[PDB]
Amino acid sequence: AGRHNYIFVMIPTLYSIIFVVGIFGNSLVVIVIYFYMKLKTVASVFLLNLALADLCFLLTLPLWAVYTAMEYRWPFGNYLCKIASASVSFNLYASVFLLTCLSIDRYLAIVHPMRTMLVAKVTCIIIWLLAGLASLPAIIHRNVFFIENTNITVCAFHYESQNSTLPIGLGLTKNILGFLFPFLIILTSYTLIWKALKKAYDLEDNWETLNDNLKVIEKADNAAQVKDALTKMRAAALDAQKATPMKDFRHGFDILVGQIDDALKLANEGKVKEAQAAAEQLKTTRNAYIQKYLERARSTLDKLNDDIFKIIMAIVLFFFFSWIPHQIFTFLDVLIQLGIIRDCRIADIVDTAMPITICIAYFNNCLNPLFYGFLGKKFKRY
Amino acid sequence: DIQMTQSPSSLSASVGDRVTITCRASQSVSSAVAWYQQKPGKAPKLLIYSASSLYSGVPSRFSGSRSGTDFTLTISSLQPEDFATYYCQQYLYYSLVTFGQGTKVE
Amino acid sequence: EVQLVESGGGLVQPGGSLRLSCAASGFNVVDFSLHWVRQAPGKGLEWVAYISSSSGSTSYADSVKGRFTISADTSKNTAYLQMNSLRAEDTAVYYCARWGYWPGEPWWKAFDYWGQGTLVTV
Amino acid sequence: LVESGGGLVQPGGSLRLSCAASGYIYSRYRMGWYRQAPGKGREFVAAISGGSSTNYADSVKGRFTISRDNSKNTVYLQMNSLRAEDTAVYYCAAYKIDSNPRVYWGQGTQVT
Ligand SMILES: CCCCc1nc(Cl)c(CO)n1Cc1ccc(-c2ccccc2-c2nn[nH]n2)cc1
């Protein structure tokens, strides 16, 4: 009721600070990406379009700032009530589609490292068109409504009944197309990334154990340090053979263990000098069959060193963390619209926490630039 | 000298129960762990080689898994014929063979 | 089918000698390693020694190294083991087992076929 | 889902425009009536709910009376002196003003 006025008077100032922070940071991001990076990779095109969508949304943000400040007294008219809400919904849809495409591109780049810039631009245009199409409900049904006989006007959503089933659809098309289907694609594209990293790390971790113990054999001539070092090498050779990133990889390690078994043979008798001679041959086998598969493991793990992967992970994680309040509360509204819940408290919590969730959901719009300078060590110099 | 330790000294269970035996190795032996079953007065019989692969002619009750250095043997249904001493084994190298201590399911 | 049969067991005073022989059938010693696993009465299985006929290799347990002499004969498809300077601990049931060579799967199968077992008393 | 009702009548007569609504669109939503005169836009005629006092248009306050019913989940509009330019089509709207404002309209009923 009127008690909510005290908290809600601070909503417009949060909108204003978000607007200024975003309109500065995302503009800087645009100029940085276009100039110091020159859009030389596919990951740059998607991020630049994310920044452009942020610009487009933040341009129409201050209308809602005064709309909440004036306590729902939208004066800008119908031609802006039908475009500001459209801009908000389009921002949501375009941002989530761009994030899904970014995650798919990261998976393809670090799991399948095999002109795509033009393909990126085409996909970007398709994403913008699809987001504009999904913003059609705000294009059509959003309309200025005169409250009572007074002169108060609100950018109300006109559920014209007896010709529309949408009330169920709109609350669900957001929760499905804007958060659910994108989540499955992104989670799948990042679980597959983890599997490819785990296989690459296992080969690198086990081959390290071969390297350190190989150094131990040369430096020690105790006739038992060779046994201890060789035993840990054979166990590492077997483990690395199972870290599949086909016959060449298996045949490459079958000979490798055979040399360790040969070296372990004379370590038993006491021929220390002959022990490291057989262990020295391990380098020859490595350079032939294993080094080819050893560079890919480091190359794949080197993609985590890229600042792009750090930035995209931060952007994707925050977007779905900040949208989990509103998307959950949106589903609650959908259930309450069909009569599933008939609780005053449920209706009250949905109708009073939703103002905060919208601010929370679009809070990420002014935090995308802050993820560039925080994790983009290169971006700091710009 | 990889020491191999078996946790359940003498597992007690009834018919139809699902029993497990846990093996822990001193060093890392990769997946080179085998499980045996010595009925009394008879030679041991191999059940699971490579710590996860069932042997030929062995009922599918026995299933083995490896979690780093932790090797476990699982019997889905404890038939009355599966009452014998189960022995761990690690076979990283020919001269580095060390068995467990024995878990007799009673 | 592939089977392994032992022999040479008996009763002897400590410090005696026995000729524990591990005969093989079905397979050949030239493509398998014939180990020796023993267990004291009521105790767990303990490794003793092994022969690599193809590679001519041999090894022994730490409590057994320098005590027993092992050998193989591929002509008769049988293994051998010599007992020297027996002790009270040496008494056990000696199982001869077979184990494949590293290149391929037969290595991963561990001791897949064990011998019938022979009893040695001191 | 917003229903409607009513019909035509001779000048000076009276009739009860009815409009039933679902449990959601009645309990928490300000249920009201808007008249859309031919060649004109919709204008406020009445309202009975929404946690606020009932409101009539200044041109209809004399002979209009909107009523409700807690049992059958309906709202009735009781016109008394139907003359002048009251000939129009009446929409039964149920608007709830929040951070996602909604206006549930309904099928119009021509009245003459
Ligand atoms: C930071 C953006 C604030 C937007 C906003 N705050 C308030 Cl308060 C309102 C009034 O309803 N509005 C207008 C508005 C609210 C929700 C949406 C929206 C969001 C996601 C998905 C769909 C929509 C939508 N609502 N109507 N058409 N599309 C659009 C506009």
Angle at A27 between CA A118 and CA A375, to 5 degrees: 80
* A221 CB-near residues (< 8 Å, 6+ apart): A272, A273
- For residues C43, C45, C47, C51, the Cα torsion angle rounded to the nearest 10 degrees is 130
**Do residues C48 and C20 lie in contact, with contact meaning Cβ atoms separated by under 8 Å?**
no
Which residue is associated with the tokens 């309990």? D27
Q: Does domain C3-121 have CATH number 2.60.40.10?
A: yes
- For residues A118, A122, A127, A130, the Cα torsion angle rounded to the nearest 10 degrees is 180
Which residue is associated with the tokens 């994310």? A50
Interatomic CA distance for residues A2 and A283, integer angstroms:
78
C-beta atoms of A239 and B31 within 8 A: yes
The count of domains in chain D is: 1
State the resolution, in angstroms. 3.3
- For residues D79, D84, D87, D93, the Cα torsion angle rounded to the nearest 10 degrees is -50
The CATH 1.20.120.10 portion of chain A extends over: 195-302
Interatomic CA distance for residues D47 and A377, integer angstroms:
61
How many other CB atoms sit within 10 Å of the CB of residue C66? 10
**In chain C, what residues touch B99 (CB-CB under 8 Å)?**
37, 44-47
* A254 CB-near residues (< 8 Å, 6+ apart): A241, C102, C103
Q: What radius of gyration do chain C's Cα atoms show?
A: 14
**Do residues D79 and D86 lie in contact, with contact meaning Cβ atoms separated by under 8 Å?**
yes
- What does DSSP say about strands B70-75 and B62-67: parallel, antiparallel, or unpaired? antiparallel
What's the start-to-end Cα distance of chain A, in Å?
49
Chain centroid, CA B60 distance in Å: 14
**CB D99 near ligand 1, within 6 Å:** yes
Burial of C4 (0-12, 13-18, 19+ CB in 10 A): buried
Write the CA distances from D105 to A160, A277, D75, D92, D108, integer angstroms.
5, 90, 14, 6, 9
Interatomic CA distance for residues C5 and C25, integer angstroms:
9
Crossing angle of the two packed helices A225-241 and A272-285, in degrees rounded to 10: 20
Q: How is residue B14 written in tokens? A: 């009834």
Q: State the DSSP string of B48-82.
A: EETTTEEPTT--TTEEEEEETTEEEEEESS--TT-
Write the CA distances from A197 to A102, A135, A243, B63, C11, integer angstroms.
18, 38, 11, 28, 61
- What does DSSP say about strands B85-90 and B19-25: parallel, antiparallel, or unpaired? unpaired
Nearest to A84 by CA among A29, A147, A19: A19
Q: Is A380 helix (H, G, I), strand (E, B) or coil?
A: helix
Touching subunits of C (3+ CB pairs, under 8 Å) are A, B
C-beta atoms of A258 and C102 within 8 A: yes
Domain interval for residue D32 = 16-111
**Do residues D61 and A374 lie in contact, with contact meaning Cβ atoms separated by under 8 Å?**
no
**Do residues A159 and A166 lie in contact, with contact meaning Cβ atoms separated by under 8 Å?**
yes
- CB of A238 within 8 Å of any CB in chain B? yes
D9 domain residue, yes or no? no
Total residue count of chain D as it appears in this document: 112
Write the CA distances from B103 to B36, C46, C51, C109, C117, integer angstroms.
10, 15, 29, 21, 21
- CB of C37 within 8 Å of any CB in chain B? yes
Interatomic CA distance for residues A18 and A12, integer angstroms:
10
What is the DSSP code (8-state) at residue C114? B
Crossing angle of the two packed helices A324-337 and A344-361, in degrees rounded to 10: 150
Structural domain spans, chain C: 3-121
Beta strands in chain D (DSSP E): 16-20, 30-36, 42-47, 55-56, 64-69, 74-79, 88-96, 102-104, 109-111
* D35 CB-near residues (< 8 Å, 6+ apart): D42, D43, D45, D86, D88, D89, D90, D91
Q: Which residue of C has its CA nearest to B102?
A: C44
**Do residues A57 and A365 lie in contact, with contact meaning Cβ atoms separated by under 8 Å?**
yes
D1 domain residue, yes or no? no
Q: CATH topology for A4-179+323-381?
A: Rhopdopsin 7-helix transmembrane proteins (1.20.1070)
**Do residues A230 and A264 lie in contact, with contact meaning Cβ atoms separated by under 8 Å?**
yes
What is the DSSP code (8-state) at residue A365? G
Q: Out of 1.10.540.10, 1.20.120.10, 3.20.20.10, 1.10.10.10, which CATH number does the structure's domain A195-302 have? A: 1.20.120.10
D96 domain residue, yes or no? yes
Closest approach atom of ligand 1 to CA A178: 21
How many other CB atoms sit within 10 Å of the CB of residue A321? 11
Residue spans of alpha helices (H) in A220-343? 225-241, 247-269, 272-285, 291-302, 307-322, 324-337
CATH code of the domain covering residue D103: 2.60.40.10
Tell me the one-letter amino acid at A55.
Answer: L
Tell me the one-letter amino acid at D13.
Answer: G
Write the CA distances from A86 to A129, A340, D27, integer angstroms.
13, 29, 30
Q: Set out the domains of chain B in order of their start, with CATH numbers.
A: 4-104 (2.60.40.10)
| Ramachandran region, residue C44 (left: φ > 0; alpha: ψ -120 to 50; beta: rest) | beta
Write the CA distances from C34 to A260, A262, A269, integer angstroms.
21, 18, 19
Q: State the DSSP string of A125-166.
A: HHHHHHHHHHTHHHHHTEEEEE-TTSS-EEEEEEE-TTS--H
Total residue count of chain A as it appears in this document: 382
Mutational pocket test of ligand 1: of A88, A144, A153, A359, the residue with most ligand atoms within 8 Å of the beta carbon:
A88
